[PDB]
């Protein structure tokens, strides 16, 4: 089995920076992952994006610092070759 763990703050702060933790298990091959803040609900616009590497060197964990500046919700998206996972996040101004 190959599983992933995505960690994020509950409500996204508009203006302030947020840390998004990605952890992967069951992988021995090194690969890249993209963590992005995208529009709700069609993902037509991307606000902030961060590419992270996952390998044996960093123990298959990484994070990206992402922010949103001036809408009720955004999408947090984590994409790679092996998985694609999105979560709807509420925002406060």
């Amino acid at each position, epitope marked *: 089995e190959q599983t992933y763990v995505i960690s994020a703050p509950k409500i996204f702060r508009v203006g302030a920076s947020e840390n998004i933790v990605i952890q992967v298990y069951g992988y021995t091959e090194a690969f890249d992952a993209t963590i992005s803040i995208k529009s709700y609900p069609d993902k037509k616009f991307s606000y902030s994006s961060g590419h*992270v590497h996952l390998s044996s060197e960093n123990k298959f964990q990484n994070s990206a610092i992402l922010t949103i500046q001036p809408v009720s919700y955004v999408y947090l998206e984590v994409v790679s070759k092996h998985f694609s996972k999105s979560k709807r996040m509420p925002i406060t101004y």
Partner: antibody
Amino acid sequence: VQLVESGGGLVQPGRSLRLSCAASGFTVHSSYYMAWVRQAPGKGLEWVGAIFTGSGAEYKAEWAKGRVTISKDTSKNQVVLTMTNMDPVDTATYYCASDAGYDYPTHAMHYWGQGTLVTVSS
Amino acid sequence: DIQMTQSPSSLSASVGDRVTITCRASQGISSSLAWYQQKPGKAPKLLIYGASETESGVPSRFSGSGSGTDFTLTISSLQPEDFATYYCQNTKVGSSYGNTFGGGTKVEIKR
């Protein structure tokens, strides 16, 4: 997806080689595993090294370590190879190659450039 | 780096033959293996990715198999366009591996 090599030709012995690879048809949403592959006349394919376009994570062959530097650019989508202290042994056709990003599950070289001939001679 | 051993180095075959080319890795790489075709004066072309998946555009006669250390490229009904040199490559990215190509297998016209 198209890959164009530039910066090949005649290199003097001892000098530093620098090759650029420009990629077309790359999406910003995905990271790409871009490699350099060389082939001497009448010989097989030799993997020099590679870089992920997203994170900038560098991977190299054990013979290439200490001599080879592979660098990246985000907006330009250009990957640059640098090889220090060139020798007649390094005379080869140098290929820029790439995977298909997150669309395909493996790091196989799906796309290949035309290749540029590098001749190391005095 | 990982070593990829190809056997044989060269083989003689006719149009319509079933051709078997083997690739052997020095350590286990699961399904992370690609097959390439190269004609003289031309850039290499991907045939098989992920050990057993044929790339779109590549004819169905080309098929890959194997997992772990031993891998096999099969061409069922050999065509005039199939005469070339064939390379296997480990595609597993990592500091302990490297994306090493095999020595190559030249498929030559038997007479």
